[PDB]
Amino acid sequence: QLNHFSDVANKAANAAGDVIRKYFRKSPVTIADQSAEEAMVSVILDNFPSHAVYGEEKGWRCKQDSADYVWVLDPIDGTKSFITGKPLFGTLIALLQNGTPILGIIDQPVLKERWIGITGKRTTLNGQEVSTRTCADLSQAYLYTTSPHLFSGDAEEAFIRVRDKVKIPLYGCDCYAYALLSSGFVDLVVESGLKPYDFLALIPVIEGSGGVITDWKGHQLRWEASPLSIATSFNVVAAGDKQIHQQALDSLQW
Amino acid sequence: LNHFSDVANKAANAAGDVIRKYFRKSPVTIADQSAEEAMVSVILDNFPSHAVYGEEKGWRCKQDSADYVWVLDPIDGTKSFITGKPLFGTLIALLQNGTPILGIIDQPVLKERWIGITGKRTTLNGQEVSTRTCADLSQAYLYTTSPHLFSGDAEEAFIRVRDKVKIPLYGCDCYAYALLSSGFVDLVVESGLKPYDFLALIPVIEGSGGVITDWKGHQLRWEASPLSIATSFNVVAAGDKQIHQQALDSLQW
Ligand SMILES: [Cl-]
Ligand SMILES: [Cl-]
Ligand SMILES: [Cl-]
Ligand SMILES: [Cl-]
Ligand SMILES: [Cl-]
Ligand SMILES: [Cl-]
């Protein structure tokens, strides 16, 4: 069963990539996003007709009234990158069992880079194991932040506080920032105003690399996709090392 | 000349082999120095009468003076390189009597090379490219970067321009200008760039149909010489001359 989930997830990512490559650097993004979601959904349900999907394009879909397994998808996380021809958007696929992510993929179909996190296993990039790196103090950290997606003033004040404490503050890049964290190239990623289809896939990838990812209070990030769930916005902080994470929480003062 | 192009490509190939050895393995200092060595060796093997110029060593030439000077940056975007993001680039400019006549923006990981040569349309991996038309600054896609020398006046100007455009995004060193030259964005604005990070851009952008100037709209120029000082400049590049002028009006420089 679990191998089957990984195999189908990879097929779904391959189908999405084939669509996205028809559109990138040729609206095209709306067509690409819709078509890629459809491609993924068809793969998923051909294999697992008792599952549900929740997608960034069309919301909840299930041919039954409920499902134990829900695939939460964003074919193009980073539409602004995609539109401007920058190959740092990604396709996100999460599989949730009873609301808990058990598999997440971050796929860059132009660069041909795929991070896969699966519960029980170490995260891989193109089949090779990856790890976060150790970092003992926030003053030594490499950080990605992005402008608040819902323009929160309070969020910006928190962003200033954390950027002032780190070694190198850099501007983020959607899911790709977290991929680089999971591979050990940066220490901290902070973002405000993300919907669940843009973070759930991240969780198994980061945790299975040895990192940590929570909301800005340090609480578990959780969104139980269901027929009635509402895709609200969340604030996220991810770290390669637990010590740095806690120091970041202290700076966010949330 | 076609000979100058051939050699510039050989130099970019030599830098790319070095860079790909070190990327995602200080690593950056070694990669930067070794890639500059590789480039210089190809350049001077072919043109012993030419000069080279880089940040670390400044002007070098076997002779006291040179009509042709190659101005290099092996890794424009060291922070991207160190964090494993493949959006840094190698920049090569050849200047004849102080004027850029060839520029390369090379992304050795992504295997993307933009070449500008005076007289020719700019190419990406051998295919001609073009900037796009854009009707008004309110429709523009913009890259800006934080001021490199932390100028508060520059930040005020950035705020003005970002507030006028359609989509304000954060830049990415030379790669932003590459995307401009290929017609995927309309405007790039940066403050506090040294000449080794902008000279190569000029033939690339102009040969794609775009415009690049300082914030007053004046020609970007820097004659590399034995006594030149690598000062810092403010740069604005656009795909379309009309957007360029509106940008200058918002910068109020
Ligand atoms: Cl099933
Ligand atoms: Cl926000
Ligand atoms: Cl939060
Ligand atoms: Cl010679
Ligand atoms: Cl500045
Ligand atoms: Cl200026």
UniProtKB/TrEMBL annotation, chain A:
Pathway(s) served: Amino-acid biosynthesis; L-histidine biosynthesis; L-histidine from 5-phospho-alpha-D-ribose 1-diphosphate: step 8/9
GO molecular function: histidinol-phosphatase activity; metal ion binding
Binding sites annotated in the UniProt record for Mg(2+) 1: E56, D74, I76, D77, D198
Keyword Ribosomal protein appears in the UniProt entry: no
Location of N6-methyllysine modifications: K86
Keyword annotations of the record: Amino-acid biosynthesis, Histidine biosynthesis, Hydrolase, Magnesium, Metal-binding
Transmembrane residue ranges: none
Chain sites annotated for binding Mg(2+): D74, D77, D198
Cofactor(s) it depends on: Mg(2+)
Record-listed E.C. numbers: 3.1.3.15
Chemical reaction(s) catalysed: L-histidinol phosphate + H2O = L-histidinol + phosphate
GO biological process: L-histidine biosynthetic process
Domain of life: Eukaryota
Family: Belongs to the inositol monophosphatase superfamily.
Protein name as catalogued: histidinol-phosphatase
Record organism: Medicago truncatula
Range covered out of full length: 62 to 326 of 326
